[PDB]
Amino acid sequence: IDIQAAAGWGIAAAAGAIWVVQPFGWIK
Amino acid sequence: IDAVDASTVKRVANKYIYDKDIAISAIGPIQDLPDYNKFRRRTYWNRY
Amino acid sequence: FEGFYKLIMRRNSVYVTFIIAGAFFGERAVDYGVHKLWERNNVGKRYEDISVLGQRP
Numbered sequence: 769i770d771i772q773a774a775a776g777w778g779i780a781a782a783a784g785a786i787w788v789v790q791p792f793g794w795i796k
Numbered sequence: 797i798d799a800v801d802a803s804t805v806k807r808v809a810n811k812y813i814y815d816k817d818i819a820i821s822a823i824g825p826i827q828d829l830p831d832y833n834k835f836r837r838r839t840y841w842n843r844y
Numbered sequence: 845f846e847g848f849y850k851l852i853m854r855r856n857s858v859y860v861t862f863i864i865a866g867a868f869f870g871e872r873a874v875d876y877g878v879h880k881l882w883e884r885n886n887v888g889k890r891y892e893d894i895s896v897l898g899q900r901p
């Protein structure tokens with residue numbers, strides 16, 4: 769409930785970063 | 797009883813408690829008792 | 845199916861990820877549909893529908 773939650777909230781933060789900033793083209 | 801370990805307790809609690817409807821019966825000076833919606837919200841933790 | 849449908853309802857982090865993804869995809873899909881119907885409603889009036897586009901003299 770501590771490691772799984774940390775992984776989930778990191779995934780959510782990364783998704784939110786990809787959604788707010790949309791650098792589709794920086795995948796180089 | 798010995799078969800009931802911590803993971804068993806969590807599984808059963810997730811089946812019966814987590815985000816579940818509740819029944820409330822109260823009597824007396826109960827104005828400060830929180831309403832049904834507050835009790836219902838407190839059946840889950842949004843930090844998880 | 846059931847895996848995601850059980851994660852979204854049981855962990856708020858997964859639900860928050862689902863909300864973000866839904867916002868992203870739904871806003872793109874509406875931007876796309878709204879531009880398609882705009883193009884259909886304005887046939888011939890575009891900058892690139894100009895016949896003499898490219899010959900100023």
Ligand SMILES: CCCCCCCCCCCCCCCCCC(=O)OC[C@H](COP(=O)(O)O)OC(=O)CCCCCCCCCCCCCCCCC
Binds near residue numbers: 788789790
């Ligand atoms: C009313 C709302 C209240 C709640 C929200 C308040 C604000 C929350 C935080 C907002 C800021 C963080 C999100 C940034 C998103 C980036 C935008 C983006 O991707 O741009 C694409 C965007 C493309 O626009 P398009 O062409 O229209 O798609 O490009 C830019 O705007 C490029 C420039 C972005 C630079 C913004 C930097 C923000 C400040 C960072 C800190 C500055 C000080 C640092 C000093 C260091 C000294 C040690």
